[PDB]
Amino acid sequence: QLTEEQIAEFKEAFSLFDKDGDGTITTKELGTVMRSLGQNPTEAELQDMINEVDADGNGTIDFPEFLTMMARKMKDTDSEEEIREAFRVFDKDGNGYISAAELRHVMTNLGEKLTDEEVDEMIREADIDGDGQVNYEEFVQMMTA
Amino acid sequence: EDGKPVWAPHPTDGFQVGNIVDIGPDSLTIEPLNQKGKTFLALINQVFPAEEDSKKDVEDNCSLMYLNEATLLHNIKVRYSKDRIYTYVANILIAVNPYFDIPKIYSSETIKSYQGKSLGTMPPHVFAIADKAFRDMKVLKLSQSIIVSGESGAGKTENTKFVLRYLTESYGTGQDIDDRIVEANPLLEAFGNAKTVRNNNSSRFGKFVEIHFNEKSSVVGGFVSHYLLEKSRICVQGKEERNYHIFYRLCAGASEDIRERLHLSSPDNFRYLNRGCTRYFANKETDKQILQNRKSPEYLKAGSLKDPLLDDHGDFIRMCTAMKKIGLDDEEKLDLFRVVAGVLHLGNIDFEEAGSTSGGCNLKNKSTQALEYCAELLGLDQDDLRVSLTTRVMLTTTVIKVPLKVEQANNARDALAKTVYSHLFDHVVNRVNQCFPFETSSYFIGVLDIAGFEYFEHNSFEQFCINYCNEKLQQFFNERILKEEQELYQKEGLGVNEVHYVDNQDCIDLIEARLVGILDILDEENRLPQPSDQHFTSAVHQKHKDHFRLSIPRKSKLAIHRNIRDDEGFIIRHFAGAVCYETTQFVEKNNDALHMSLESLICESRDKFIRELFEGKLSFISVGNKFKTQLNLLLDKLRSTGASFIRCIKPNLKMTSHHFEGAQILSQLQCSGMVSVLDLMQGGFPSRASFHELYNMYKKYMPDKLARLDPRLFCKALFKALGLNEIDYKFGLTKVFFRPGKFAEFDQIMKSDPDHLAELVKRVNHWLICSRWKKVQWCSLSVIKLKNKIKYRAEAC
């Protein structure tokens, strides 16, 4: 299961899944977020895990169903490998650092609207060591907090 | 606040706009906005706060900044000229009859548009309730009920037909049961529907048309059940009222080859018709078709009754067309007229006092030929019927005959008419249910339709049982509303909170409690050797001397009620206010005396159709208990099912299109229990707005940086910036919830100093960058955890 502080951070992330604001998502909505962030599932497989969690019979994923849709008992190092795989979606050139240009590409693909001055403002707060780029150590202190 | 508009009590419109220019301890000096210089006085409880933008309407009434009955009345005034007749108040649908057919709303393309769509996201319509009730049947694993109230002409017939249309189109694949109720509607317009002081065509029974669903989700059958009937109306009526409509439509529509077989005569002759109104409903064309011998002196003097739809001569034809369609032949149709005519020739039998010989009563000599023409309609012997209407048969084990008193024989003769017609209406309903037998039973979606809170200037015993039935339904109404709100707060993640509930159990205990209740004293008065109505009235204020739900008539502000003497009536406060009832004839209308000597004679009839109607201890039985016992068989059935409350509004007295009367609509908001439920919701969070609603309202007042954000983060940043109190303002899952008057307080914070607001947005700018980082970081970790779920699941395949 998930902790209360882990549910709170996924609750704000669910607004990027549910952009319409009705509190519930379909396969037209949960498909378009996966494909916008580089992952292409097949419709049959994402239907099968919807038919696990949805008890309503309607095929529409609300927030408590979305929580049990990504939950599973995993081992200790499996967890750390998921955080590292997330870092690698932000890093486009694969150098182990996230620049302003690389952070801007994830923002625009998720639909966040922001200026070039705001992108430089974001990187600057996340950076701790003063190089102006976010290494894995600085990425986890921003995530965690 | 000062300067802010409030609603003002205007007699012709209910409420209008207005301002407060002076004030006192109990009163407010109200100056109208449109009529300046008219400056009247109004009390603290008669004024209500109004919203800043009054030119806008809302589909959902929880989106109002001030939720009250004056802003609800203005919401259904604006929606009436936009032709939006359906209005969403939580789990309550408010439907207003327009008396005209609106385009495309009843369309089959519209029906399949609503199908399976989420709730609240589609415009309000009656098909959005029927689709919800199918989904909160199969998912819930429980049966459902649609509750339809309102007065006649409010669209309660038409709303029922749209429910049965949606179930045999959207989910039922075949089964043509929907219009078999509609096709045999004139049978229930004759047998069950009567005429009351404020309604020309009123249903006087609890119609429970149920639709059976199997486990495979198909319509397997329907069934029509009936509850309640006005036992008194059968034999004695009020001023200007009628009996049931089959006792006028058979008189008006009968031919002379039928009149010779039933021995029918004009209504003036018959005691169960001459007490009230004898006039027929008709139009100019059918007034020419009514025969001279069917006309009463009152008909000659005052003519036909005017109604745009009712025709007692022509609807008897459309009744006999419907008996041919449903399943009745002409011989069986004639046997449903022999029982009705036998009731008419029973009421003219009188009873004098016996000549000292053995005590008791005897029949009058003027009632001799009247008994001969009645006993062949009942299939009994005239010498055995005379004994049975005068004696109490018992045994000493020989079998003796002990005569009854004169008043007990008048009550026993009318008890036979309140037993034969009671089992005749139960035979009509059972015959109709045998014209469409259900295949099987499992789950069910039914429609309960009954008359609303109906009352007149002087109220009778018939209206006492209607308002007592609506008080018990008002208890279950508020019980279902509180349960919906408690599982809304949990669903939005707000959790449990304290809310105050209003009780009406003290009004129920007043009317029906054992030994001390009003119906319990009434049934005891029948047992006394000399019943009285002055002793009944004084006994009510004997046992209930205190309480607020009951006062003397002279305590009333109304002059008409102040003319009633202390022993002639009482005032009982109900959910719809203080209703006076007179006590004259109350005990007489309650008293029924069907005893062994007569109950075991009508069952023993030589006629076969009569024995089919009827399928020591207790003597006089318990008459005031049958009204409580039959109602408890429906209230616990309503507690065992889900509920879908559809309140029906009549907009004007004439019943004509495009007319709004706010002195008649507001009286139905306070007589529907709607205002009571809005009082309940002030205890909770009555005002709630989605994130997309608050984004469209307040983005223009915000800085361009904050405006760029998505609706949920826009509202989250705005709530954090302002620093709002946690017990007054609550951040939900799809909506922001507010305490009373705090959505209004919120709207004034946004309209206050732009520089101050800009500085508070500057102070939350670090948190907002950190929130916008964690939003895209935990969303990318969400896609990776759903990638790890697809692999984990496919590892066990």
Author numbering:
A (entry chain T): 3 to 147
B (entry chain N): 2 to 398, 405 to 622, 636 to 817
From the primary publication:
Based on these grafted models, bending produces a 30° reorientation of the lever arm, which protrudes off the filament axis in the ADP state but is almost perfectly parallel to the filament in the rigor state, providing a new explanation for early EM observations. The converter rotation and lever arm bending results in a ~ 35 Å displacement of the tip of our modeled lever arm, with a ~ 10 Å projected displacement along the filament axis towards the pointed end. While our maps and models do not contain atomistic detail in this region, it is tempting to speculate that bending is driven by an electrostatic interaction between negatively charged residue E14 in the proximal light chain bound to insert two and positive residues K736 and R732, which can be seen in the high-resolution rigor-like crystal structure. Our models suggest that nucleotide release is coupled to a converter rotation that licenses a lever arm bend in myosin VI, contributing to the displacement observed in previous structural and functional studies of the ADP to rigor transition.
Myosin motor proteins are responsible for movement and force generation across multiple scales of biology ranging from muscle contraction to cell migration to intracellular transport. In this study, we focus on the MD of myosin VI, an unconventional myosin motor unique in its ability to walk ‘backwards’ towards actin filament pointed ends. Finally, by comparing the conformation of actin in the myosin VI-bound ADP and rigor state structures to bare filaments, we find that actin structural deformations accompany motor conformational changes during the force-generation cycle.
